[PDB]
Amino acid sequence: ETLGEKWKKKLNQLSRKEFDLYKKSGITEVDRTEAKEGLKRGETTHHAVSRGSAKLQWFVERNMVIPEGRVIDLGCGRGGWSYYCAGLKKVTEVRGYTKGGPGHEEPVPMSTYGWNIVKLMSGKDVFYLPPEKCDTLLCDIGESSPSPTVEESRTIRVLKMVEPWLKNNQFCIKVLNPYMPTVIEHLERLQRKHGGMLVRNPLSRNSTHEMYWISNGTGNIVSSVNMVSRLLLNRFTMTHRRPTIEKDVDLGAGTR
């Protein structure tokens, strides 16, 4: 039994009160107050449509993924990753696919910087989508579940789905449950072929063990995974530490 499996058992034992204090203890988060207010009023400039823009920006600013050319954004939701990439100098086209419908977010139309090079499509289950040529492959799919076996199945499914999209291009792919032994085996095989590394984003909540497989890096998958498991277990042992609050992204306005 993995350290991550022990973390999951502990997370499942929490009351709603305990879970709510735990999930943000010691994490980093952007202040969405101004963006939520502007979006509520129907504003289409400057605001990021979700917390996603800042989450991807964290990786991009550290050169972990360098979006360029034709960007494919799988599970785009409201469009946080897409509208962020649309503003980047090297990016020429952004194509977002999302499921939408009940239980899913719909793409939000925006007028942020470079909006004209973005096309977001809803009603698109990526598990039935044929792979397309692209210079950047983004994937943020992976629904949390109290069952680690359900998360293990969902993660493997995403990992098998993304592989044909990967052809010596830039990438950033969510790995929902990276601690299950069968997932680690798939990741090790994938890293031997396509390279890259698994990275923990400080904007992720403690209630998820999600890590992201980024194209620009190397390192021991097992060690990076166990380091996250150790962090998340230690965050149960102390009293709630308020999250580090950072400024949210300004995505500007204007065409490209």
Ligand X SMILES: C[S@@+](CC[C@H](N)C(=O)[O-])C[C@H]1O[C@@H](n2cnc3c(N)ncnc32)[C@H](O)[C@@H]1O
Ligand Y SMILES: Cc1cc(N)c(N)cc1Cl
Binding residues for S-adenosyl-L-methionine: 50, 80-81, 98-99, 125-126, 141, 212
Q: Which of 135, 140, 152, 248 is catalytic?
A: 140
Q: Which of 4, 77, 107, 148 binds ligand X (CB under 6 A)?
A: 77
Question: DSSP string spanning 131-196?
Answer: P---SEEEE------S-HHHHHHHHHHHHHHHGGG-SS-EEEEEES---SHHHHHHHHHHHHHH--
Spot the catalytic one: 29, 55, 73, 105: 55
- Under 8 Å between Cβ of 181 and 195: no
Please list, in sequence order, all residues whose beta carbon lies within 8 angstroms of the beta carbon of residue 72, skipping any fewer than 6 positions away: 95, 97, 132, 134, 136, 137, 138, 165
Helices 148-162 and 181-194, packing angle to 10 deg: 20
Q: Which residue is nearest to ligand X (CB)?
A: 52
Does 23 qualify as catalytic in the annotation? Answer: no
H or E element that contains 95? strand 91-97
**Least distance from C-beta 124 to ligand Y, angstroms?**
13
106 near ligand Y (CB under 6 A) = yes
* Active-site annotation holds for 37: no
Closer to ligand X by CB, 181 or 252: give it.
252
Which residue, chain included where needed, has tokens 């009603």?
Answer: 123
Q: Is 55 a catalytic residue?
A: yes
Q: Which of 36, 62, 101, 244 contacts ligand Y by CB under 6 A?
A: 101
Query: 33 to 52, contacts with ligand X by CB under 6 A?
Result: 50, 52
102 is an interface residue for ligand Y by CB under 6 A: yes
For residue 229, give Cα distances in angstroms to 4, 10, 59, 207, 226. 5, 12, 20, 11, 5
Catalytically active residues are 55, 140, 174, 210
Binding site for ligand X (CB under 6 A): 50, 52-53, 75-81, 97-99, 104-105, 124-127, 140-141
Binding site for ligand Y (CB under 6 A): 100-102, 104, 106
